[PDB]
Every structure is written in structure tokens, then in C-alpha cells.
Amino acid sequence: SSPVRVGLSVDASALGHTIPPDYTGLSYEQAQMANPNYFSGANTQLAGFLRTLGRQGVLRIGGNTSEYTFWNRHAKPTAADEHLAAGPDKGHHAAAREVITPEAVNNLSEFLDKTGWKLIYGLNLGKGTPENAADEAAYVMETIGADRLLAFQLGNEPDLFYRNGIRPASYDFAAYAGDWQRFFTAIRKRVPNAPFAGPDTAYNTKWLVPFADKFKHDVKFISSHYYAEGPPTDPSMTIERLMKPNPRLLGETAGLKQVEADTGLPFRLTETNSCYQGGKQGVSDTFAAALWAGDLMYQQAAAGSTGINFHGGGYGWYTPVAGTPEDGFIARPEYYGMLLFAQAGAGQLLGAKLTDNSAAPLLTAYALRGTDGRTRIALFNKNLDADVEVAISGVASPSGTVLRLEAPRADDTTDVTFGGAPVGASGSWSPLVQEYVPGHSGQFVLHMRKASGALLEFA
Ligand SMILES: O=C(O)[C@H]1CN[C@H](O)[C@@H](O)[C@H]1O
């Protein structure tokens, strides 16, 4: 009904980046490692949610709580630890001290085996010692093994140590570089092959750029963070603003691309979500987050990112997966945007140009030549008030199907489906609605409701 009529032109000759198979990922608080039941081979529910997000992917463990977690080689989990549900750190005050045990690391290894995911593991540079980091790294490497361990990170958001009471106001990149080298040196004595990434901050000029320049021979990739919300001085983030382009993201991405050109280091977005402080109720925990997250995954893949890790845990407002081993796990709305990406699969991005779209400017579209040879198109109609009718040219196929990413309202906290079905227990998901996209004159026409997504697959 009264859609904006737009054109989408796919160009199979306009080659973009190849999405790596381990692009997807999640980030969790290191405090969660206090509970050996969470990242465990026994946590079949959570493992299933990860496998549905990707047969390959990366689990990053870090966050603010990584400055408050203290590995101890003799420790055993307490009764309290065995029930801990560590949600995103809200950033209001110091996290609780937690202990990480051998048992938790042993169980993490088995969780990585059950999921097939690789690991980015934070070490406690904020408050811990080099020697303990070396010992923790040694045990992780011993246990998890080089093939599954992608990187250690030496501190989380070190540019914010002072804001969070971890370093004095004078702490700057030069001070952090000294800490980093002390930790690096200690760890490499115990773990000569230890891989690193950093600086595990948002892009900025005073930390990330000089980090890359100084440590490019010592790290495997650059790790960056991104939250769509800006500083606390901004108007409170809304769904409307979450759907819009974020010029800061665009600039930071360009910055990362220049770092890669200068240093050779690829970049991964190792911690991201919509809003700070564990998210914003009525924004982060809504269907709009699915549109935002799915679109972000493709925007960053098209920009040459190696991958992404959406922060979460517990029942945090922005978590993709919520729950506990005792109570079970569920897919929150954001998960469904990641599910659309998962179902599209890997391949090479292609040119996909929108026209006649000024009245529906928040529609995005990405075309992909899948590794199976089939063309897919992921569309995010992020316009909150405009339906669209998309005239698709540049695809020659006898049959196109669509899987829709839907909820009845953008701010819904539930009622989210993909392919006509919710995700069930343990990540199980099957499409239940089959819809063909009408074809005529070598073109296709796709209707999309306001605030919806679609994944098209062409035979
Ligand atoms: O929700 C947030 O604000 C995020 C910011 N980044 C930190 O590394 C996380 O621990 C968490 O506090």
C-alpha cells in the first residue's frame, strides 16, 4: 500500500570484499568465566544458538570486567560462581572482583569444540600483573590450543581506564604502550607463539593509530569497538536515530582502512552494540536492533572488516542471546538480524545500487555471490514509515525466494520472526513460510513493509 518505488541494480562485475567464514561473532564479559557452567560443553543450549549464527565465528571474552577478573591456577569455582550470570557491564562503578579457574578454561575449550568458534581472550592489564597474565595465557594456550585461540588482548578500552578509575588522569597511549610491552614480554616468555590483537578501543587518533604503528609486528590484527550511541552529551539514542547513517562509524571505518593500508593489519570489530551501559530499554532490546545489527554486519563487511562481535550476556538490553544454564536461553530481537546474515552465508559482495530512493533513504541493500554460486540480496528497510517496492535488475534467474525479517512494530521486544518462524530452543530455526519474488522482463519486484528486512536467494 502506497510504497516508495525504488530501483536496485545488481552488478556482478562490481566486485567487493569476500566475507570470511568466521565473520560473525559475539562478545561477553570476562566475569562470565567465573561460572564454569556457562562456556561449557554441557551448555548445549548456548552452543546451539552460536552454531545457528555461524558454523564458523569468533567468541570474544573481555569487556570492562576483564580488569576485575583474576586467574588463579589453584582456584576452584565457588557455589556463587557456579550460578553467576554476567551481563554486560553497565559502566557506572567498578565491577566485582572475580576469579577464573582452570576448570573454567577447560570447559571453555570444550565449548569452543562444540561450537566450532575461535576465541579472542582478554587478559587483565588494567589491574593484574604481567606474570599472572603470562600464567593465564599459558594455561589458555595449553588448554584451548593455537588453532582455536585467535588472539589475546591486553586490556579492554584502555583509553577509558581513567574514566573508570583503573589508571590516573595522566594515563595516555605512551603509558599504555609501556604496560602493553611489559605484558607482551612476560606472556611471550611463557607462550612464545602467543597471538595478540589490540588496542580493543573505539578508533581514535590518540590510541588506536599509534598502537598500530608501534605494535604492528606484535599483533595479528587491529581490534576496534563501536557503539551507535555517541557521548552522554548527545540526545538519548532513539530507534529513529539508530536507523540512520552514523557519520562517525563511516569515519572510523575509513580510519581503520588507512591503518590497514599503512601497517598491513586487518581489523575486526571485537565489541559492538547499539547503546552503552548494557543497552537502552526500548531501543537495544527491540526489533529495530535486528535491522541495525544485520545492516551493520553487511556495511562493515563491505568496508573490509574481518568480522564482528556483538556484546552481550546475561539479560542485557542489547544481548543477542539471553539466559542462563539453569533457566535456559532465548534469542532476543538482535539475534534475528545476525540470523539473516548467517542464512545468507559467505561469498563475495557485489555492487548493488539504489535509485529513486530519496523518499525511502534508510533502505539498504547488499548483493552477494554466495560460495555456492547463488546470488543473494540482503535488504534492510530501516525506514520507519515508508514501505518500499524494489525493482531489482541485474539478476538473471528462473526463481527467487524471500525470507522476511519481521515484527509488527519497530519497538517490539518480541514477536520477531525470520522466514515466518521464531528461533526455538537451543538456536533451532527452520523457515516456515515460502514466498517467491515475482519475476518479469529479467527483473524482480519485491515489496517490503516499513521497518522490515528480507533475504533473497536466486536459483
Ligand atoms: O555496554 C557498554 O557500555 C560496554 C562498553 N564497553 C565495555 O567494554 C563493556 O564492558 C560494556 O561496558
TrEMBL record:
Gene3D superfamilies: Glycosidases, Golgi alpha-mannosidase II. It comes from the Bacteria. It comes from Acidobacterium capsulatum (strain ATCC 51196 / DSM 11244 / BCRC 80197 / JCM 7670 / NBRC 15755 / NCIMB 13165 / 161). This is Beta-glucuronidase C-terminal domain-containing protein. GO terms for cellular component: membrane. Beta-D-glucuronate binds at E29, N64, D89, N156, E157, E271, Q277, G278, Y318. GO terms for molecular function: hydrolase activity, acting on glycosyl bonds. Residues 365-455 form the Beta-glucuronidase C-terminal domain. InterPro entries: GH, GH79_Enzymes, GlcAase_C, Glyco_hydro_79, Glyco_hydro_b.
